[PDB]
Amino acid sequence: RKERVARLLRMHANHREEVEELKAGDLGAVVGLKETITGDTLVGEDAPRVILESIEVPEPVIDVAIEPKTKADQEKLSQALARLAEEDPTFRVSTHPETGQTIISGMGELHLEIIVDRLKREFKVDANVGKPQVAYRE
Amino acid sequence: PKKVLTGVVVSDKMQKTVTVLVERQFPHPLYGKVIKRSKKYLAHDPEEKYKLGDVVEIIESRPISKRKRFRVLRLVESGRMDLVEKYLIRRQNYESLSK
Amino acid sequence: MVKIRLARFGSKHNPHYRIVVTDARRKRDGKYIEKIGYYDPRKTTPDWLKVDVERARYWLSVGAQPTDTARRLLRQAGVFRQ
Amino acid sequence: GRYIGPVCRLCRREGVKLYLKGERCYSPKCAMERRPYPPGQHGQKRARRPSDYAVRLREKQKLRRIYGISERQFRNLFEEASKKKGVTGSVFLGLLESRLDNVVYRLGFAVSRRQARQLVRHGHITVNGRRVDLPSYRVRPGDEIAVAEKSRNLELIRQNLEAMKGRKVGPWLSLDVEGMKGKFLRLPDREDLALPVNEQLVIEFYSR
Amino acid sequence: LTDPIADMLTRIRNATRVYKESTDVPASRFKEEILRILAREGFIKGYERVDVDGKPYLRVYLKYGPRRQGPDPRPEQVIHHIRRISKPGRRVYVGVKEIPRVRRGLGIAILSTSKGVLTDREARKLGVGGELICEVW
Amino acid sequence: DFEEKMILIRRTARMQAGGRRFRFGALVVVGDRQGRVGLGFGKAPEVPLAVQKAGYYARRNMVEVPLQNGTIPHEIEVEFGASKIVLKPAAPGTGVIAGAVPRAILELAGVTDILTKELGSRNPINIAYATMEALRQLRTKADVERLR
Amino acid sequence: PTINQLVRKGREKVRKKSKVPALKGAPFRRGVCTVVRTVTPKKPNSALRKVAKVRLTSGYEVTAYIPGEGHNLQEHSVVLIRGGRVKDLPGVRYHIVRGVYDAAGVKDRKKSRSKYGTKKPK
RNA sequence: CCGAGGGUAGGGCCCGUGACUGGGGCGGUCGUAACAAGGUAGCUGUACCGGAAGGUGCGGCUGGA
RNA sequence: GAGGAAGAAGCCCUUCGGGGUGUAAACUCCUGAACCCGGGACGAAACCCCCGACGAGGGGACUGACGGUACCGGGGUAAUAGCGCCGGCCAACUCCGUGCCAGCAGCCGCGGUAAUACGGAGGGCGCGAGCGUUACCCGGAUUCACUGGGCGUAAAGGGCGUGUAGGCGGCCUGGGGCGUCCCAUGUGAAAGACCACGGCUCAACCGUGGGGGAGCGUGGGAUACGCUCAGGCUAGACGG
RNA sequence: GCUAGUUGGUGGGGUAAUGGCCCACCAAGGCGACGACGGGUAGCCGGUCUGAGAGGAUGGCCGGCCACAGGGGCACUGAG
Numbered sequence A: 001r002k003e004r005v006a007r008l009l010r011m012h013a014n015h016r017e018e019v020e021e022l023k024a025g026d027l028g029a030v031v032g033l034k035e036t037i038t039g040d041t042l043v044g045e046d047a048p049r050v051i052l053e054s055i056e057v058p059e060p061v062i063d064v065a066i067e068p069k070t071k072a073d074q075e076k077l078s079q080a081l082a083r084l085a086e087e088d089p090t091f092r093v094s095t096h097p098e099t100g101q102t103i104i105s106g107m108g109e110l111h112l113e114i115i116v117d118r119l120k121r122e123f124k125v126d127a128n129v130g131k132p133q134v135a136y137r138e
Numbered sequence B: 001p002k003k004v005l006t007g008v009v010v011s012d013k014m015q016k017t018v019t020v021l022v023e024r025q026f027p028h029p030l031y032g033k034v035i036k037r038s039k040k041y042l043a044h045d046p047e048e049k050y051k052l053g054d055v056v057e058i059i060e061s062r063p064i065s066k067r068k069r070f071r072v073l074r075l076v077e078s079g080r081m082d083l084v085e086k087y088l089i090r091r092q093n094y095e096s097l098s099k
Numbered sequence C: 001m002v003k004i005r006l007a008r009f010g011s012k013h014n015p016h017y018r019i020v021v022t023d024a025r026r027k028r029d030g031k032y033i034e035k036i037g038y039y040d041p042r043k044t045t046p047d048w049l050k051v052d053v054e055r056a057r058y059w060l061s062v063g064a065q066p067t068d069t070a071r072r073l074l075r076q077a078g079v080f081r082q
Numbered sequence D: 001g002r003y004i005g006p007v008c009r010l011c012r013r014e015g016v017k018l019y020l021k022g023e024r025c026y027s028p029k030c031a032m033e034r035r036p037y038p039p040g041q042h043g044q045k046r047a048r049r050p051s052d053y054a055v056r057l058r059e060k061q062k063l064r065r066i067y068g069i070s071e072r073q074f075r076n077l078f079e080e081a082s083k084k085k086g087v088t089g090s091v092f093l094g095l096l097e098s099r100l101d102n103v104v105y106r107l108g109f110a111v112s113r114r115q116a117r118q119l120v121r122h123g124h125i126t127v128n129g130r131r132v133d134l135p136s137y138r139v140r141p142g143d144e145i146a147v148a149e150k151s152r153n154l155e156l157i158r159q160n161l162e163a164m165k166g167r168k169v170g171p172w173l174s175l176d177v178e179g180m181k182g183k184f185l186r187l188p189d190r191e192d193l194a195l196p197v198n199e200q201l202v203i204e205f206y207s208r
Numbered sequence E: 001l002t003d004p005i006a007d008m009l010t011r012i013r014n015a016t017r018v019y020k021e022s023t024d025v026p027a028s029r030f031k032e033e034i035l036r037i038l039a040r041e042g043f044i045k046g047y048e049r050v051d052v053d054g055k056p057y058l059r060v061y062l063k064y065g066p067r068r069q070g071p072d073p074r075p076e077q078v079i080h081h082i083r084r085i086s087k088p089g090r091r092v093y094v095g096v097k098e099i100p101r102v103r104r105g106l107g108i109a110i111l112s113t114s115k116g117v118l119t120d121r122e123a124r125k126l127g128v129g130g131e132l133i134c135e136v137w
Numbered sequence F: 001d002f003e004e005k006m007i008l009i010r011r012t013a014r015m016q017a018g019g020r021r022f023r024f025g026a027l028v029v030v031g032d033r034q035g036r037v038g039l040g041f042g043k044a045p046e047v048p049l050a051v052q053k054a055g056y057y058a059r060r061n062m063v064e065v066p067l068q069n070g071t072i073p074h075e076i077e078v079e080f081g082a083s084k085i086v087l088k089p090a091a092p093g094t095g096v097i098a099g100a101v102p103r104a105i106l107e108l109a110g111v112t113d114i115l116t117k118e119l120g121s122r123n124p125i126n127i128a129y130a131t132m133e134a135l136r137q138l139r140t141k142a143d144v145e146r147l148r
Numbered sequence G: 001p002t003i004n005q006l007v008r009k010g011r012e013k014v015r016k017k018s019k020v021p022a023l024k025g026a027p028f029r030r031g032v033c034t035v036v037r038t039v040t041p042k043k044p045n046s047a048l049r050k051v052a053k054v055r056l057t058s059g060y061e062v063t064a065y066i067p068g069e070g071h072n073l074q075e076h077s078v079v080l081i082r083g084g085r086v087k088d089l090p091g092v093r094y095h096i097v098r099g100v101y102d103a104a105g106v107k108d109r110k111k112s113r114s115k116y117g118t119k120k121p122k
Numbered sequence H: 001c002c003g004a005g006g007g008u009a010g011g012g013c014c015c016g017u018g019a020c021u022g023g024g025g026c027g028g029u030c031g032u033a034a035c036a037a038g039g040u041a042g043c044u045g046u047a048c049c050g051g052a053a054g055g056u057g058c059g060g061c062u063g064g065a
Numbered sequence I: 001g002a003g004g005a006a007g008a009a010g011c012c013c014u015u016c017g018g019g020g021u022g023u024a025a026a027c028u029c030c031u032g033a034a035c036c037c038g039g040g041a042c043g044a045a046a047c048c049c050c051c052g053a054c055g056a057g058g059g060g061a062c063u064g065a066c067g068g069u070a071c072c073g074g075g076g077u078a079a080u081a082g083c084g085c086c087g088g089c090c091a092a093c094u095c096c097g098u099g100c101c102a103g104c105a106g107c108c109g110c111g112g113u114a115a116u117a118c119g120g121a122g123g124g125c126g127c128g129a130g131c132g133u134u135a136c137c138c139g140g141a142u143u144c145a146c147u148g149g150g151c152g153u154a155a156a157g158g159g160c161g162u163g164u165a166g167g168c169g170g171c172c173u174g175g176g177g178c179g180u181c182c183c184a185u186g187u188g189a190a191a192g193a194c195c196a197c198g199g200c201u202c203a204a205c206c207g208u209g210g211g212g213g214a215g216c217g218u219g220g221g222a223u224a225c226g227c228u229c230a231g232g233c234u235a236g237a238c239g240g
Numbered sequence J: 001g002c003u004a005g006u007u008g009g010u011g012g013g014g015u016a017a018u019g020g021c022c023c024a025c026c027a028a029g030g031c032g033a034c035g036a037c038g039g040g041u042a043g044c045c046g047g048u049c050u051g052a053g054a055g056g057a058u059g060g061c062c063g064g065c066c067a068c069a070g071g072g073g074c075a076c077u078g079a080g
Ligand code: SF4
Pocket: D007, D008, D011, D012, D017, D018, D019, D020, D021, D022, D024, D025, D026, D030, D031, D032, D033
């Protein structure tokens, strides 16, 4: 997708400095963009449309189920953690094949803690959480 | 020109003012047929000389009160209390168009 | 005050005025009082000016003042010749 | 842009030699001679009874494919016709024919309209000694359809000008050869031109 | 009787479709004036100012085509079509440029005017208009 | 001779113990394109016969149709019971602006330019019989004057 | 009706009823997936059709159809919808536009890809 | 004096929502009311009764005999 | 772009002979989008300075964002094609895969082992820098019917009267001229739409001229129909 | 069904100016099935789109009028 690069800023100890260019081998912050997320290559318009090497590693280590209590406001969460997932790309929402509960998965206790604590104290969510249900058999 | 119009006095129960009912005719813009319609004009009678029945001409004049914007021009005909009933019997009839 | 000036028409890079009489406080290209002839600053056709000199006098008389380049194409076709 | 693809197939579908290829059209090596059935896997299949829409559809593509032109431009010409005075179908062929690139072909400067269009788009033609490259230039009665005189020393105008010293440009045209010029004198009459086209079937089409 | 005219054209219509040699219609000056047109225009043979039980009528003489060949020997009609246009229910009034053109020429519109009871050809040349009274063909 | 166009082929069906038994019917218009037309509708136990039969009845029943530079004299409205054909006359540039049933019955009589419309039941068979009886109701300034 | 009756009582104009009230007038609307299941269609038919219950940014919660062979949809899938009754299915009256939001296009599609949001193969 | 508006109090309309409940639409269990004189001609307004269709009284209709 | 086989390869079909894509490709050759160089604008002649008189006329000077862009001149490489459909409506047909599954679907309806209706393929049809889809407006809808519909049984005569307003209203003569018709006149801005010409190479775009109408104001005129007023009639109606 | 500044009047204030615009008094009026009052929706027009037309639909860009300047009220200065 095409995207306008309005302004370019360097962040100093105490102030924000505007700068008209940012050469290669350097870091800075560009103002203007709209769709770009983290780990996304960015090329000048008339250039080879190369995709930088991505990144890639660890799969989440801890798993916690979240129950949308009641019930027409499950989906306050549905749009909440879609805003989240492009904000943090390390948690992982999933819904269980059997049992049908929603299963946020994480990088650790702490990671799930704030993500959860946010989900409520920032999105109100009528919801509680705990041990995932087990898919049994006869 | 100051619009002149012709009609019957239906109320003189005011004070230096008479109500002049005015018919006009025109064709229905979709269905051709000629139709009548009407309008009551509050009309200035400074010398109180006009009365029930008196078909008169009234003329577009400068404002005299809220809703009086015509003064009577000339007495044209007299005693047309048939038209006066033609309008009371319609008014009166209203008392049975309620619920 | 009431004025004689160029009311642009035409299109982009195709100027096509319409020297005109209108109240000073209109849009340039808004409701004018009278059209007294066109003007084609680019000179694309034999008629790139035809001031109705009969009219253009009547105005100047009763008040109307004009652009420092309204008169330019008003003098050019002489509304001023003694 | 234009049709650009396999062009015999046009003719094979249409059941009529449209003389699109120009130089080859008269050869026994044309396609319409060896196989005059429709293109593709199903031509030698005993054809089926054609609907009225079809009949006018086929008739229309026929006319259209002849002048080798975009259905957009075709329709817009056609609309101009209906609104213009008198007989639509005629005035259609008129305006269809009053267009440049096809003139150049009528005046044999080039072999086919395709080849003609190229010539026109390339600046190798000029109306009135003003250089004109737009293949949709509606030519009006009185115009001098020159060849660009800096395009004069060029193997292909020659070749085609050379086979055009005393053939007959239709009643409305006037090829002063040698000097490379020619002229657009009259917008055609209906009788002025025969194409394998029912001028009326096409009007009945755009009436749906 | 509500529309004397419609009545007459319908006296006349009903008449012809069973080929009555004549039919009588109660009389008025205005009524005559239209008949006077029907005649003059080849629609009826014409008419005379008769009298029934002392009542002033008009006798309209009807007019047809030849006997025909085939299993329906009834003649074609001279007035094929006749119907009121303007009406007590709905007045029709046309100005001169508004004037209709019946059967691509072959028929007429008789139309009252402040200059007589004319036909369409007539008023169009006289430069007037009025009440579209009917149409015949 | 004349030109034929089959306008409507259709299978019907009738009932009888153990089986529905068919019979086909065909409506055909026939015309010279210079002034005569005709129409007949015929029904055999086999398609192609009934088409031919429709033809037989086609020529057995024809129509005047007084052309006029390829249009008709007056505008005409006919109803064949619930179905209703309307013909209007059109200037020499137009074309046949009609249905499919009236398209044929007008093209074969050699109508070159017409405005029409099918109010009422747009049933083919009655729209047919309707278009005809409206043609055979066309007259001219002549026969009018002749009659008056 | 007499000409008077028409003068008096006029003629009643016809008004039309939206078949996509859920869109609130928009071309398409966005939503989230609350349930994703299959459903069975009425006589004379008999498949297991892939549906989604979808809560729109309009307020409405509607059930929508998932066109194609297979999908990637499940609970919390963000999705874009368009007008489109599916005839056999009680209460389905919009479609998920493949190739948008979390709607995967169709693997291996060759024809009409415009309509199953599949990009052009190399 | 008037006065944005604040406040007290009583009303009218609209919209959303509510344990529960009423029928309506869409996708097995009981009987057989209607369609053939449909096995008691059918339908009817009303009325009483009955798991249910419906039955019955009184009058009407033929769109029945 | 021109030429280029009784017609390559691959692929699709096949009664196994052949058929199709297809002059399409390759191939010869001709042109030469982009690019490269060279030049390079119209839009700007007034304000002001000079003679005159700070006026009329005359003459002189400065000023260009777009822009080194348009366009011109010279050189100059074969150089993006995609999308919808192909049961009927509706233009376009075969083979496999599948087997009420997977799916299609605007309406009919299609899928249960031989599917032109699903999926792929070859072929075909239509459009082409677009092609389709959803939303909506008018159209087909003469299906709110003025143009231009209807009510015994299809939806539709009020259970029946009596009557209010209203709508409608017989034959003759006359006055008015309200409706209605006619001529004049003012208004009906510009853009638009329409016809003509003309500027940009064409067109889109745009400029100049022409033609105006409904509608309303004002004056003149007509009188048949409708209106109102005035007399007469007896065929409607009431009465004896 | 509506209506007490309600409808009319005498006098006066206000204004560039007519007026219940505002005020004091007198009168008892004014409006309504030709749809008042009330509820809904909407800036209007030149025009635009569709239509054989009649009609339907629409009012973004441009031109004309109106209304608004976060929500309200208010006056000052001024030719405005
Ligand atoms: S050559 Fe024969 S086949 Fe090819 S176009 Fe000319 S005419 Fe048609």
